[PDB]
């Protein structure tokens, strides 16, 4: 049990369009990197891969990860898909 939280993380005002990207990109890449790591070290630990109460947690974590990355991919593709049609047309 060793835990830390970073609290003063984000600015809520209206801000230039360039930086909303950097801040979204960075926060997302960080979240996915740590999520993936915790998944793998839940499988490598023998006390967690063999307990039926723990496996049920790992199942949810894996599924949530799958869905989150599927959705960020889909919406980004439709985002650039709009621009390319307005410009080509």
């Amino acid at each position: 049990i060793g835990q830390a939280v970073n609290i003063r993380s984000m600015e809520t005002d209206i801000v230039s369009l360039d930086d909303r990207l950097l801040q979204a990109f960075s926060g997302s890449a960080i979240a996915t990197a740590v999520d993936k790591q915790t998944i793998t070290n839940r499988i490598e630990d023998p006390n967690l891969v063999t307990d039926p109460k723990e496996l049920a947690i790992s199942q949810e974590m894996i599924s949530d990860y799958n869905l989150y990355v599927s959705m960020v991919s889909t919406l980004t593709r439709k985002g650039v898909g709009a621009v390319e049609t307005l410009l080509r047309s």
Partner: protein
Amino acid sequence: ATPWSGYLDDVSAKFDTGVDNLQTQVTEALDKLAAKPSDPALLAAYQSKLSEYNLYRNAQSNTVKVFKDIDAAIIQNFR
């Protein structure tokens, strides 16, 4: 005529999460049995509790699996 909407208990479930009685009781019954593996009165109890725990855990896993396939199939329907 149309069936009623129902009404939504939005807050309750997500913080109703907490240590289940059922696992606690399974581990307690096992610890009682292991002290005297030959008492029929204890064996009869543990058979029943372990069985219920098996059913509960399977039903739950299969349900989580079903609910997440629907969402993956929606996203794959629009991309």
